From a paper:
By cryo-EM, we only observed 3:3 spike protomer:YB13-292 Fab complexes, suggesting that excess of YB13-292 Fab is able to saturate all three spike RBDs. Consistent with structural data, substitutions at 452, 484 and 490, all within the epitope, affect YB13-292 binding. Substitutions at 417 and 478, outside of the epitope, have very little effect. Modeling suggested that YB13-292 and ACE2 would not clash when bound to RBD. 47D1 has been shown to neutralize virus by inhibiting spike fusogenic activity without blocking ACE2 binding. With almost the same epitope and binding mode to 47D1, YB13-292 likely neutralizes virus via the same mechanism as 47D1. We found only simultaneous substitutions at 452/484 and 452/490 are able to abolish YB13-292 binding, this is in contrast to 47D1 and previously characterized “class 2” antibodies that a single substitution at 484 was able to abolish their binding. In addition to hydrophobic contacts mediated by the “SNIL” insertion, binding of antibody YB13-292 is strengthened by additional interactions including a hydrogen bond between R104 of HCDR3 and backbone carbonyl oxygen of RBD residue 484, cation-π interaction between R106 of HCDR3 and F490, and further contact near A484 by HCDR3. Together with interactions mediated by the “SNIL” insertion, these additional interactions likely render YB13-292 resistant to escape: single substitutions at 484, 452 and 490 are unable to abolish YB13-292 binding with primarily effects on antigen dissociation, explaining YB13-292’s ability to cross-neutralize Beta, Delta and Omicron BA.1 variants.
Author numbering:
A (entry chain C): 365 to 562
B (entry chain B): 14 to 68, 77 to 142, 153 to 176, 185 to 210, 215 to 247, 257 to 413
C (entry chain L): 1 to 219
D (entry chain H): 3 to 234
Write the structure that this text describes.
Amino acid sequence: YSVLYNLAPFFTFKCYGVSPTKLNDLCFTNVYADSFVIRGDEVRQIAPGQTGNIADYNYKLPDDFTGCVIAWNSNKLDSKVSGNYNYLYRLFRKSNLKPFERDISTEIYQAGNKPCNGVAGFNCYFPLRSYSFRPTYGVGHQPYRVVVLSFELLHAPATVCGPKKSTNLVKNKCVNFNFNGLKGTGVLTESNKKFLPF
Amino acid sequence: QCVNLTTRTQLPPAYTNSFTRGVYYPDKVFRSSVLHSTQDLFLPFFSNVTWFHVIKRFDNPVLPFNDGVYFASIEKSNIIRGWIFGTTLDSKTQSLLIVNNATNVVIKVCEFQFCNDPFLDMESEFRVYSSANNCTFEYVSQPFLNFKNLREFVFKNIDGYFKIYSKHTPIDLPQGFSALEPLVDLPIGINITRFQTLLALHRSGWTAGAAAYYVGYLQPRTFLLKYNENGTITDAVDCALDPLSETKCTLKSFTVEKGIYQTSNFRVQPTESIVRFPNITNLCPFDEVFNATRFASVYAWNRKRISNCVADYSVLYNLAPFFTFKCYGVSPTKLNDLCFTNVYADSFVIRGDEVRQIAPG
Amino acid sequence: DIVLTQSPLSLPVTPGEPASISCRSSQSLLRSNGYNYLDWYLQKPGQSPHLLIYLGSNRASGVPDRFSGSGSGTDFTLKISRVEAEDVGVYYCMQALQTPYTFGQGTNLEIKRTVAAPSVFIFPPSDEQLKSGTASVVCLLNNFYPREAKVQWKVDNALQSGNSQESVTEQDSKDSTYSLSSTLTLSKADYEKHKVYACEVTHQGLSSPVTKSFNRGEC
Amino acid sequence: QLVESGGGLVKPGGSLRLSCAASGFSFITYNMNWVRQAPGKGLEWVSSISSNILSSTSYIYYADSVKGRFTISRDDAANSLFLQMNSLRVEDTAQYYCARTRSRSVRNCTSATCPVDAFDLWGQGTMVIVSSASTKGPSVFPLAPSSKSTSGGTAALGCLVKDYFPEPVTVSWNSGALTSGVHTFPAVLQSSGLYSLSSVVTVPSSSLGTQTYICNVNHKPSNTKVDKKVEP
Ligand SMILES: *[C@@H]1O[C@H](CO)[C@@H](O)[C@H](O)[C@H]1NC(C)=O
Ligand SMILES: *[C@@H]1O[C@H](CO)[C@@H](O)[C@H](O)[C@H]1NC(C)=O
Ligand SMILES: *[C@@H]1O[C@H](CO)[C@@H](O)[C@H](O)[C@H]1NC(C)=O
Ligand SMILES: *[C@@H]1O[C@H](CO)[C@@H](O)[C@H](O)[C@H]1NC(C)=O
Ligand SMILES: *[C@@H]1O[C@H](CO)[C@@H](O)[C@H](O)[C@H]1NC(C)=O
Ligand SMILES: *[C@@H]1O[C@H](CO)[C@@H](O)[C@H](O)[C@H]1NC(C)=O
Ligand SMILES: *[C@@H]1O[C@H](CO)[C@@H](O)[C@H](O)[C@H]1NC(C)=O
């Protein structure tokens, strides 16, 4: 990620969590990446514990997020000559969603006591509404390309861990070592403890 | 392509006991001859584990998945091959399929077009599904397989991971203690609400050997385990099994001397708290003050005292009122789970993005 | 499929009084949750149709309050309170029980306006057209009412068929009238041995038809 | 859907391409339907299709004719739509409307029955012609004036346009200077395929011998302009 800081035109870690330089000293695994585009003032809505327009109908961020989000401006790739109406956003649901899941459903939301058999009538509308994306729009309406990076730690053996190449080995010296994300100081002696493969 | 079998005898499932069955290693923790208690999904003893017998009988039913399950099988000459996991067992959802042929073991999860009676047919025909459209995860594993062999399996779904345990030992259900090692941690990452077992029918038209297998459940409870020099589990003690083992586990010792101990406490369990409303029930006039042609100003806001009425919120579209409901306040699920009086209603109009300006603090 | 009828197609609508239209469906609409499976489409001639009433008896798509659908049971009707010059369009009804949608026949909707005296125009073929081998004589009407009229071509006091065609235009907001032109084409050999040509114009507002007779010999 | 692209001569053994050229609109997530119409009175729905946003299945809705010959192809990525077919047996005048359904969701719909609310997005531009052979040059013929049944003192002369196949022909009188009395009649179909036009004007008879009357009829496909002076 040292070169990926500037291989793509995005703001370098405008989020909360582990320090960007300190990410080399982690043994996280099983990352999750989601791809979506937001509109203008929705940057503030994507935060752990935030309750915004996105955080009330589209994507819920739990308090124990153990990560952050990455967003940047996209006024050229996401904005063609014609209006870009290829992405929509939910506004109508009976209740809030559950964190870290998605529920896509093309269903008419009913407001009144009477039910609707998929008919947009008196008190029955659709939650999905088209984005207003145009290259001539202002900063409050420009499409922003957003990807979320999760750095949670699992008790399972980390198949990803951290990118810290390889180095030599030493024995019988009280030295500080960081193994599987845990720091400890001591010698490296030989013991006859039986180890099962797991 | 599947063949429907209507020769199955209508025989109700049998039941037996699980005196010393349903034990396994909790995690990859290693300990040296110490006693530790772990809260995990372990089958309590003296339970009622279901028994199915196959001989001419064809016992391959479908059972719902509510909690963790424990599987045992006195399997000989490699009759059982795999299991079926899925919510509806069709192509509408991604379902787990276990295939065990004579060459190796392959594990694949896709949207297979499963039939009502999956079976296998020398043995080269596999009539378990017609075709699969597309999927991502494909895994191949090394083969794990007179009553001379006993196999036990445990299936759990934690963090969307497929955990399966295997153990082969030579030997009704035999009596003995044998822990199950962790074998495969496959990240399925899907929803499973039903399970079904796979049986192979050897053609000789079809002949099935005398294989007996047991399927059970799991319960979240604390289990006391003692390790050794090699880290193998010696015995399992459950506090909720009986008060004797409760006193054994609370004292953290397998041997309890002569005396009296207060192992726990007991009390009655309340059921419900209900309130009747035969008294005053006219709705408070919230609609006519929330929907009015004239509203007060920000500097001089109206103050109205509301009492002696019921504060109905269903008429105000409690599910979605088309308002700025993103305020934290009281949670909407527990907003109905409250009871209060002396509400304050002050309304005004502003301009711009000052909606977030009106906040506590 | 579902067969439909359009018996109110010949509806002489007039501003001032309400008018009604109807259609018949073979199947019943009673199997519904209070939503009538009826709709009305106004097809404006020339550019695009317009939607009046969607499914159910409700107002939508910015239509005026005069249009109001109705129907409860084995019936189909549409209530119109006022008729203006913007109501030029045919009507259709549809039931959405099955996916093979098949619309019925169209209507006419001739607005019963003030009757105007017809004018008969005769145009003999030019000399170049006469010697070109094909002779076409045109009987034209300007500022005559209504649009629908019966025209007959009589040659040598005999009936003619298979060579007369009629073209109809749309209404004009200047004077609320229609203009139709009838062209009678014939070959050179057909026109050579014929002597007199005349087109009979039949008008609803006239007790007797008017006919103008002319013969070859004048420009 | 705003404008449509079509037209041209195609053999019965050939294939057409019915497409709707959309604009800034939520056409990607809105299901639509194809409705044809006879040259006379009476419409007829022909085809319909949905999008992948509704469900994994495409919610297929075919009648007999489209099942026999036609097929659909939805890109499901932008505001584009194309219709494909193999042959052509009886296709003379079809409007081929590009309207969309008034039901964003699809509920209580089987593979053969599906309720629909209404349509409001009809368009113009899907015309089909298979009888086109060549773009013959126009043959403008003058019409003799006749000051009868037109208040006497006003004359009535015009130009006759014959021997032309395509319907759109630019017809004007006095280079567009004269407005009152101009009535360009629509083209009428003949048994030979080609069309005919009649265009007359109402002018006073006192200026018949002084003012010059030249009818301006130009045909774009034939690239031929014929000018004629009306004279008794
Ligand atoms: C198990 O259940 C069966 C019937 O469901 C019953 O007859 C049997 O007594 C039960 N056994 C135990 C140990 O509860
Ligand atoms: C048989 O086993 C092999 C393992 O090498 C596997 O690739 C193959 O898919 C298996 N056959 C079937 C029908 O699953
Ligand atoms: C997989 O196949 C199904 C049907 O065979 C198709 O709908 C789907 O798009 C395919 N997926 C990929 C990634 O090719
Ligand atoms: C799995 O599906 C069942 C059936 O609808 C549902 O009750 C359950 O909540 C689902 N579980 C998850 C984790 O989605
Ligand atoms: C532990 O395993 C080793 C394996 O060689 C065995 O020799 C030893 O006896 C085991 N310990 C006990 C207490 O059984
Ligand atoms: C509540 O209602 C009962 C019967 O309807 C009545 O007897 C009682 O007085 C009421 N209580 C109050 C506080 O109004
Ligand atoms: C509620 O408010 C809406 C818009 O503010 C208005 O259209 C409606 O008539 C109001 N209803 C009542 C009962 O005041």
